Amino acid sequence: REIVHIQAGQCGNQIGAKFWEVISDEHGIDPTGSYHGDSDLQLERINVYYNEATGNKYVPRAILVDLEPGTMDSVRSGPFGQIFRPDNFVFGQSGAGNNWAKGHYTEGAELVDSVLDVVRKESESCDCLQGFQLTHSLGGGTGSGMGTLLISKIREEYPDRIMNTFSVMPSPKVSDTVVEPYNATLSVHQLVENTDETYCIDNEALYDICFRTLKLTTPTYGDLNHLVSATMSGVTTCLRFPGQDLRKLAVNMVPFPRLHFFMPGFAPLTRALTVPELTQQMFDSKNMMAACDPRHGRYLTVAAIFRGRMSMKEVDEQMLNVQNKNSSYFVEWIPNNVKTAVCDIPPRGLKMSATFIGNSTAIQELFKRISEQFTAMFRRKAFLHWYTGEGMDEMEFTEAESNMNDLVSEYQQYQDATAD
Amino acid sequence: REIVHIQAGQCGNQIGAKFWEVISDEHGIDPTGSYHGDSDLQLERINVYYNEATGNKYVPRAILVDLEPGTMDSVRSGPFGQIFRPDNFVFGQSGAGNNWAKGHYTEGAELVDSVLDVVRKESESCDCLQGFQLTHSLGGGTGSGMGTLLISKIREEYPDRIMNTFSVMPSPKVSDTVVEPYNATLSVHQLVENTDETYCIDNEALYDICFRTLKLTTPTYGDLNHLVSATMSGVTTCLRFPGQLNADLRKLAVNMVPFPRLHFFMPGFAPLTSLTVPELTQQMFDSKNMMAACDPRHGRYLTVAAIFRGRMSMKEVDEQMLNVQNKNSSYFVEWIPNNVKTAVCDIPPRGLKMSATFIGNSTAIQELFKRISEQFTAMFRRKAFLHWYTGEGMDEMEFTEAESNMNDLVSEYQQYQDA
Amino acid sequence: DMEVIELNKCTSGQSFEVILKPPDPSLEEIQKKLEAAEERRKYQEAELLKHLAEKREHEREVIQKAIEENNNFIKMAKEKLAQKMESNKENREAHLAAMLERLQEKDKHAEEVRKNKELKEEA
Amino acid sequence: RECISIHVGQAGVQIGNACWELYCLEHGIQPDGQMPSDKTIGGGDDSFNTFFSETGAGKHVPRAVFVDLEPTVIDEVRTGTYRQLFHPEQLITGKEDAANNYARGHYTIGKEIIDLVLDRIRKLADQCTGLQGFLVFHSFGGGTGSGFTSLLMERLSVDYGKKSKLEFSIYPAPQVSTAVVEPYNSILTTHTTLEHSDCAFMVDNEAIYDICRRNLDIERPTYTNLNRLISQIVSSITASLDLTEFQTNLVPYPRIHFPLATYAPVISLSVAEITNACFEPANQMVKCDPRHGKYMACCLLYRGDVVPKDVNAAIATISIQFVDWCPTGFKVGINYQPPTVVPGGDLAKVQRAVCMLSNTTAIAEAWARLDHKFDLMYAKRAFVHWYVGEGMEEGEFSEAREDMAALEKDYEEVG
Amino acid sequence: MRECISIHVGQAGVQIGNACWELYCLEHGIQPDGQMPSDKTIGGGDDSFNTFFSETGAGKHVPRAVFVDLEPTVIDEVRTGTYRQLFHPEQLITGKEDAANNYARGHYTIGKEIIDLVLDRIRKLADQCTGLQGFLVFHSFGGGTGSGFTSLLMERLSVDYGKKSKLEFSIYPAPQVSTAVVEPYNSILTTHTTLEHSDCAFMVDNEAIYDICRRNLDIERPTYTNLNRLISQIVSSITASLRFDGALNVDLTEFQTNLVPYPRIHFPLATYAPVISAELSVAEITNACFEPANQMVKCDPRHGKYMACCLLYRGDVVPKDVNAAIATIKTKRSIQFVDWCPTGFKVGINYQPPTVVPGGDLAKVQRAVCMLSNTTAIAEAWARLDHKFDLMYAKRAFVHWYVGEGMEEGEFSEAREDMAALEKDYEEVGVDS
Ligand SMILES: Nc1nc2c(ncn2[C@@H]2O[C@H](COP(=O)(O)OP(=O)(O)OP(=O)(O)O)[C@@H](O)[C@H]2O)c(=O)[nH]1
Ligand SMILES: Nc1nc2c(ncn2[C@@H]2O[C@H](COP(=O)(O)OP(=O)(O)OP(=O)(O)O)[C@@H](O)[C@H]2O)c(=O)[nH]1
Ligand SMILES: Nc1nc2c(ncn2[C@@H]2O[C@H](COP(=O)(O)OP(=O)(O)OP(=O)(O)O)[C@@H](O)[C@H]2O)c(=O)[nH]1
Ligand SMILES: Cc1ccc(S(=O)(=O)Nc2cc(C(=O)NCc3ccc(C)nc3)ccc2C)cc1
Ligand SMILES: Cc1ccc(S(=O)(=O)Nc2cc(C(=O)NCc3ccc(C)nc3)ccc2C)cc1
Ligand SMILES: Nc1nc2c(ncn2[C@@H]2O[C@H](COP(=O)(O)OP(=O)(O)O)[C@@H](O)[C@H]2O)c(=O)[nH]1
Ligand SMILES: [Mg+2]
Ligand SMILES: [Mg+2]
Ligand SMILES: [Mg+2]
Ligand SMILES: [Mg+2]
Ligand SMILES: [Mg+2]
Ligand SMILES: [Mg+2]
Fold first, then answer.
1. Residue B305, min C-alpha distance to chain C (Å)
2. Is B302's C-beta closer than 6 angstroms to any atom of ligand 6?
3. Location of the Glycyl lysine isopeptide (Lys-Gly) (interchain with G-Cter in ubiquitin) covalent cross-link (chain E)?
């Protein structure tokens, strides 16, 4: 069962390319595109992300999208550039200039039809399409505006299939662009309704890990993208490896439709770690890709994935330990809400690793942060004519703000919920 | 004068197979069907239970009935399995599921006609048919359910013929199914009306006899069956051997059954083992020799038939029996003068030199039907397991009617106990 | 004191009498009673055959009640399974219909946003 | 002057041919049927011809017919020693007996077989230039001996109102009996045949049993031991030959036609010794109290070396009462030839013997016991369903009981 | 004649089905060829093993089974298994997408896509049967396919085959080896619907078999195959009386009649003795069957009354050894019976010795027994399930996944209400008269 990947905007294509390079090495596929791995577990579930082509060579089922045509050459310039098939590059005349309306309603709408054409041709060649994942940021205008428009369009064409997103949230520590709260609030307004799971990749987190932990004076985007790639690899592990699908994880992780925003975590960040080390470190706020202290909220559901050669008896023992040892941080009204998976194949370089996916109400901290920044500008209607000039009304901003405030409200109500 | 034998269900076919083996051995008939005995008395009345095959051999007048093929396959595989006429096997394959309703109404209907076709054919092979004997249990589904249905059907077809049953009564000490009180009460309701006499062989008595007074170990089904086969050989002695001067089903029925419903007898054997004439008579009347789990001292015999086998003084048996009568004068009804009569057949069973059997029509047998009624009531009060019967088209009025009839019988036996 | 009459003397023997102190049926009624007994037996046979016939009718009734229960069980299974299947289809397609209607409504709103951009471009 | 004998039921058949073999030995008739003493081959008017017809070949044939609804007993005659003495037609059998059930033997199975037995009986009668009447041998308790004998009796009367019918009936005894329903069968069969029998010689099997064990010193007698003993008393009674003399000399009133016979001596003694022995109760055929009872007739039949004076002396020696309208006396008969017996039989051949035939009120004792046993079961209607199930009215049980009561009452009346 | 069709539904049902049939092939000596050198009647014959196997012309013995899963990875393994050549390729039916742990998908959305195909093949199997006994349905309680499709199948089987015997072998959810969080939903839902269409449901709880494998086989973390191999022995004991000529037997109807005191009370638990690692007595294994530790469901029998006990023995065991052991058990004051069941035992014996897969952790033994007991104590397992259901339904958690597939919240409400009645019914049948 196949998955179609789409990467939109600068950031989306950046972390999308790094992700492909990661899993292609994990599956043993060179830039040429031919399988040169040593085992069989690297092909058995490879159809999920790759399409077999003539010459015994696999090509990523990926579609690259941006209104700025230069990012296309950047991806093809980067390593594993020729592995993507040229007909899946859909590029516009020039970028959206961080204007969400340009990507969602005007310029992005011009390019969206050809994008849906590439999506259609890839989806019809699938035996049974699982769904789509989209990598993008929420601060700019392409992945933010056009991304939401894409996932909304793809929903009309495929109402019953899964839509996952890897959304990168803005942080003043990373970018000085001022209207990013506007774009993030508008796209989140779209994400709350149009996606089944969204992995909130906080640039504030990524910056904090590289600086306060990895000890990097001035970290470049390439430093942060290494984190995103390792999480994305670790999150998609069981999808791409046999033994250990989309709808099931969504059914088990999402107890309520709007609360489908997950705080990711990886361990280790960069002497193989121990299962108790990995287990503890994995539930630590210093190892979360969202700037949210999970001790400030409660876990609704938790899915763990361990990688490498280890005794699953110990994995169980430790996972139960951290659960009871921190009982209060798990809702009592969702029994067996923490599940665990183990795959023998470890990531590149690491012998021991673990990835954490948590539907936690502490993620409201992230959305609150956006809401405050959004409110500070909207109250003085700062820079709104840039969006109004494209045809948008002020009430759409008001709807996005209130809907996001509802989302953090909901998260807090269930945080305070009692078994009776 | 000839009798047609029928055996129905697991228990009925197992005790029936062992009965034919025991009396084939007494009559000098080997598993092939040909005679090889040392006395011409083994053939004088052999027709009564046998037919002359053309190949110098004899074939039992036996019909084998079951809703499941297994039992039949087992008895065909037994030592005497070759003796039975092959077309006289009537089996279904749906089984009865330990359910009286399936055996009497739904499943048993699909098989009872072709059984009658065999009952008819073997009756056309008789110069003068006295009647029928049926071996079956009361606790299961086939023997209980189809057996009563069968008995009613042959009565419709042969109303002027004597019908006797040898009926095993259920007991928790040896159980096949949990609904034995239902099946037993439901079928007793039928035997009170469509049989001329039934020998109540109680699995409770058989067990107690094999355990306590026999070996103090745990008994196998062959042990229990050994008790009833020998008992059956005893009850049938004077029908299969000459000199009786009064050896017909009808005679015994007219002498032993003073009232139509009180036709349930307590059989008895002596000795029980895997002797002196005084012991033979005395033990014969002991409750530890009763194939029904009832104490004769709790009631009064209405009529009694004793049969002695082996060479012994005829006057000894006579006076002995007279004095055990007069020693316990009050435990016989006075309003039936000379109610115990005896008979001797100098041919004893194979295995012993001198034995003795007992057929008692006594009121004490109410204790048997009482045990059933209580266990039945313990279940029916909670309507336990009942849905398996009503789901077959049965109503609860039939269960209540059946238990009320069996209680009426208990009262009737007790009533003549107080006269 | 013993007077005897001498009688019937012959070669075979004698005979005598000593003294001590001095001093309609109808065959037709027989056949009527035998026929009456036969008629009485015949009456008893009939009552049994009647009683047996009522029992056969009860057996037929029981078997018929079994058939009726099995058929109603089938019919009630068939109709309840259909009912909830159709309801489930109405519900699932109603959700997807509303979802696509809300989704097409966004599409219209986007076209209005474009039209308003065009109107403002005339400035 | 010939007489016809009919044996109904097992008891009737068995004590029947026991009598016939004693007859053949009396008259020296051989198992071949030939009689070397008979010089008129092919007929005659001798005395033994009252009981044996003659054929052209000279075979002496009993004037008898054996009827039982079941074969096992009649085939004993068909395959026995005197088998050739009987034509194959003389013996009649069904395959289903009456199951100790009067009503079954009378009203049910008796209908299907009475007409055949009648035709065969008339074929016997057509061989009689002079037929004085009938002797029937039957039991009281047995199903056919009770029910079919009754049916045959009433039919015999209508078809042969001319002749007379005498009975040789077996009274049920608790010591020797086979069915609890015997009082039922007895009461019913008497009431139906009392009007149709002119005389009726009963015999208590217990009495025969007792005198057998005691007088002959045997621990337990076989049925044949009995049969031979009864056969001697019947032999002496029939040895008289008029059926009119018996009907009138021993029976003064028709209903009380139940005399008792006493045979003596029974050794395995003088003329006076054996005559007093018949006045003793311990030698009589029915256990009975002739002490209280008053006689009404007393035929005395001797056989052997007995001359009139020996008898007259013996009677004068002995003190019993008589009915006050009957001549107090004793008819006496002599048959000089000594009584014959089975060669090697359980009783020895003796010089002299006597049979006393007495009609006394005492025999009422036997009736009362049987009546009381009847009353016990009928009070609880016990076993009545077997008879009603054969078409018999329950009322008949009473008609036969109240009549039975009258019989004893009429007996006590003439006390 | 007397054939029984096995239907294996979902991952748990299929993997347990292939475990049972491998054990069957080992017992009767059927090779992976489909050939059986101990059968003389080619392509036909009415031997006892033919109840579960059909015979084809070339000598191949084909199982009277149907494997259905809405997704092929588990079933494909059977197609690639060592026993592939035993099944006609159509006997294995597989969709393209599973029910995704969602009862609504298995019963409604995805189930209707192959239900008719499944029912068609079941009719052809039944067409191959001269005297159909009934059906054995193997499934889980908490999967989408195991709960949703099984319930749709059972409903359809009742329409097509009337009240013909339908029996279940169900795996009860166990947090230890539980794999989905909506499992209390799926379990409550399927129980509600299959309640009216099932005659009897033999229950096992995967944690109990787990603890048993841990304690008795010294396996630190038992594998799913381990669990499955034990269940195969339990199933084999239940079916040995119908695949083997035996002195004492218990057929599908006998099972029903003796183990189900009332229509709704048809959930007897399983128990099996003895479980011995590779590296005895008759009364010992019977006594073990009543010890609470060795119960295939997390249930304390001492917290309830026994309503019926079915003891099925196989191997070196004769009826006198059993009646003795049952006699010793009848004295035990620890084992209490309801006062409306005075005769409380049904027993079947098959002298054919047990058999294990060669090389497995289970040791070959000479005698064994499996007990199926209906006790009021099993209400506790219902209670623990319903409570978890309450914890999520009060907040309506996850319900939207079922509403999106056409289900109404009224279905959840009436399903739990019926489950609460089942709890109350299990309580009331224990009160003394
Ligand atoms: N972690 C990470 N964040 C990035 C990267 N590139 C851009 N971003 C973030 O993404 C946001 C800007 O969105 P972009 O992706 O540059 O914009 P776009 O989608 O190309 O749209 P336009 O440029 O407005 O047409 C800011 O918050 C950046 O910090 C990258 O490589 N890594
Ligand atoms: N003295 C004597 N009595 C006999 C003999 N046979 C039978 N009895 C008695 O007669 C009574 C039974 O009558 P049976 O002649 O046996 O009967 P049946 O007339 O053949 O009638 P069923 O056999 O009942 O149809 C019992 O009291 C027996 O003791 C016999 O040979 N001699
Ligand atoms: N004993 C046993 N239980 C199993 C096995 N596989 C799954 N289970 C149990 O079955 C339940 C989950 O149902 P599954 O069979 O995995 O799911 P399914 O029926 O395939 O349903 P979907 O895949 O969700 O459509 C859990 O309780 C598991 O522990 C197995 O091989 N053996
Ligand atoms: C609380 C809870 C109960 C049960 C589950 S689970 O059924 O889905 N099992 C499970 C699967 C994976 C896994 O990598 N799946 C593949 C996948 C699918 C979709 C996406 C976007 N990424 C990955 C990891 C851990 C678990 C424990 C999860 C959470
Ligand atoms: C109280 C009383 C008085 C008279 C009789 S009796 O007339 O029937 N004689 C009698 C026969 C047998 C005997 O075995 N008959 C053969 C037979 C018939 C039927 C059956 C089922 N089995 C056997 C035994 C004992 C006696 C004493 C019985 C009881
Ligand atoms: N004595 C004895 N009783 C048996 C035998 N077989 C079964 N039973 C009893 O019969 C009753 C059950 O009836 P059964 O014949 O097995 O059922 P059926 O097949 O439907 O007729 C129970 O009381 C069992 O104890 C046997 O061989 N001997
Ligand atoms: Mg850009
Ligand atoms: Mg007779
Ligand atoms: Mg002459
Ligand atoms: Mg599955
Ligand atoms: Mg074969
Ligand atoms: Mg059985």
1. 29
2. no
3. 320, 364
DSSP string, B358-409: EEEEEGGGHHHHHHHHHHHHHHHTTTTTTHHHHTTT--HHHHHHHHHHHHHH
Total domains present in chain A: 2
Q: Do residues A80 and A221 both lie within one domain? A: yes
Residues of B in contact with D178 (CB under 8 A): 245-246, 341
In the reported structure, the alpha carbon of residue D39 is separated from the centroid of ligand 9 by a whole-number distance in angstroms of: 6
- Which residue among the candidates D96, D112, D195, D245 is catalytic per the annotation? D245
B neighbour chains, 3+ CB pairs within 8 Å:
C, D, E
Q: How many Å apart are CA B3 and CA B166, to the nearest integer?
A: 14
CATH of D1-259, one of 3.40.50.1440, 3.10.450.50, 3.30.70.2740, 3.30.450.40: 3.40.50.1440
Atom of ligand 3 nearest to the CA of E225: 31
Contact partners for chain C, using 3 or more CB pairs closer than 8 A, are: A, B, D, E
Pairwise CA distance, residues D6 & D114, whole Å: 13
Nearest to E406 among C73, C74, C88 (CB): C88
Amino acid at E341: C
User: Is residue E10 a known part of a binding site?
Assistant: yes
Kindly calculate the radius of gyration of chain D based on its CA atoms and give it in whole angstroms.
21
Domain D363-415 -> CATH class: mainly alpha
Give resolution, Å, one decimal. Answer: 2.6
To the nearest 10°, the Cα dihedral for B342, B343, B349, B355?
30
Tell me whether strands A162-169 and D199-204 are parallel, antiparallel or unpaired: unpaired
Q: List, in sequence order, the alpha helices (H) in A263-391.
A: 275-282, 312-325, 364-378, 385-388
Please give the backbone phi and psi of residue A131, each rounded to the nearest 5 degrees, phi first: 165, -160
B–C interface: beta-carbon pairs under 8 A: 36
At D228, give phi and psi (nearest 5°): -65, -35
Interface contact E261, partner B, CB < 8 A: yes
Yes or no: is domain E378-433 CATH 1.10.10.10?
Answer: no
The question of whether D245 is a catalytic residue gets the answer yes
C-alpha span between B136 and B134 (Å, rounded):
6
Same domain? B242 vs B196: yes
Q: Which residues contact E211 (CB under 8 A, 6 or more apart)?
A: none
Rounded-to-10 torsion of CA D369, D372, D377, D379: 170
CA–centroid distance, D38 to ligand 9, in Å, is 5
CATH number at residue A180: 3.40.50.1440
Question: Distance from the CA of A73 to the center of ligand 7, in angstroms?
Answer: 12
**Domain E1-268, CATH:** 3.40.50.1440
Whether domain D260-362 has CATH 3.30.1330.20: the reply is yes
φ/ψ of B398, rounded to 5, equals -70, -40
CA–CA separation, E34 and E62 (whole Å): 7
Q: Return the bridge partners of B355, or none.
A: B309
Amino acid at D180: V
Q: Are B10 and B135 in contact (CB under 8 A)?
A: no
